[PDB]
UniProtKB/Swiss-Prot annotation, chain A:
Function statement: Immunity protein component of a toxin-immunity protein module, which functions as a cellular contact-dependent growth inhibition (CDI) system. CDI modules allow bacteria to communicate with and inhibit the growth of closely related neighboring bacteria in a contact-dependent fashion. Neutralizes the toxic activity of cognate toxin CdiA (C-terminal 160 residue CT fragment) upon expression in E.coli. Does not inhibit toxic activity of CdiA from other strains of B.pseudomallei.
The name this protein goes by in its record: Immunity protein CdiI
Originating species: Burkholderia pseudomallei
Lineage of the species this protein comes from: Bacteria, Pseudomonadati, Pseudomonadota, Betaproteobacteria, Burkholderiales
Record text on subunit structure and interactions: Specifically interacts with cognate toxin CdiA, which inhibits the toxin.
Organism domain of life: Bacteria
Curated annotation (Swiss-Prot), chain B:
Taxonomic lineage: Bacteria, Pseudomonadati, Pseudomonadota, Betaproteobacteria, Burkholderiales
Range covered out of full length: 1192 to 1307 of 1307
Comment text on domains: The C-terminal domain (CT) has toxic activity, which can be exchanged between N-terminal sections from different toxin molecules.
The protein's assembly and partners: Specifically interacts with cognate immunity protein CdiI, which blocks its tRNA nuclease activity. The CT domain forms a tetramer both with and without tRNA; each subunit binds tRNA in its presence.
Protein name, entry field: tRNA nuclease CdiA
Localisation per UniProt entry: Target cell, Target cell cytoplasm
């Protein structure tokens, strides 16, 4: 039902429930100075009504920050009872971000 | 919920049986719990929850088309059905969507359902 788009060719397909779960947690973990990164990434959803967000336009620094923000959200979620049901998709997302050519 | 909930209800009239939200942590959205498609999986897209959202989708559909279509193919490959509640799309965007769908591999096109 949606995805996290990393770059044009690299995506993490998700269900609607996974999409909502992820964007909400990741969204809470941005630093004040990095809010513009969130706005850029969340644009397809917030501006366009789409069930995806996208890091395709970020430079190496922006994406590095996004990945750090994702890992913070993942940590903050470990506490939650639901966590094992979502762990595989956190792992998919962190992995594809790590593998992104900009982080090479 | 309401967009997908409405879409599932309509889909039940054409695919039979009952459509249940998949369990938490599923990679699909809904699963048929009875009928001739019992057991088959369903991923929805383009099922806006509000009038405002449908307007947003319409205004920037062209800008988001490529990512939307790539996400669509991913889900068509993985699920048995990918229904789109496309009634709310402008005629301009319906033309864009139908044309884009026709360039996907035929095995994926057969999986995509336009809720009329």
């Amino acid at each position: 039902a949606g995805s996290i788009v990393i770059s044009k060719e690299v995506r993490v397909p998700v269900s609607t429930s996974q999409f909502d779960y992820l964007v909400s947690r990741i969204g809470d973990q941005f630093h004040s100075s990095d809010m513009w990164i969130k706005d850029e990434v969340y644009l397809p959803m917030e501006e366009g009504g789409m069930s995806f967000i996208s890091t395709e336009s970020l430079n190496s620094s922006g994406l590095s920050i996004f990945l750090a923000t994702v890992m913070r959200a993942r940590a903050a979620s470990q506490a939650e009872e639901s966590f094992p049901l979502y762990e595989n998709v956190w792992n998919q997302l962190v992995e594809k971000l790590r593998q992104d050519a900009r982080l090479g | 919920r309401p967009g997908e909930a409405g879409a599932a209800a309509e889909l039940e009239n054409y695919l039979g049986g009952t459509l249940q939200r998949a369990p938490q942590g599923s990679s699909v959205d809904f699963v048929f719990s009875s009928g001739p498609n019992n057991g088959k999986t369903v991923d929805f897209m383009l099922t806006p929850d509000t009038v405002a959202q449908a307007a947003k989708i319409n205004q920037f559909f062209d800008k988001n088309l490529n990512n939307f279509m790539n996400t669509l193919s991913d889900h068509a490959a993985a699920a048995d059905f990918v229904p789109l509640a496309s009634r709310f799309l402008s005629e301009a965007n319906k033309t864009l969507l139908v044309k884009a769908i026709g360039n996907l591999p035929q095995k994926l096109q057969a999986k995509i359902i336009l809720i009329k």
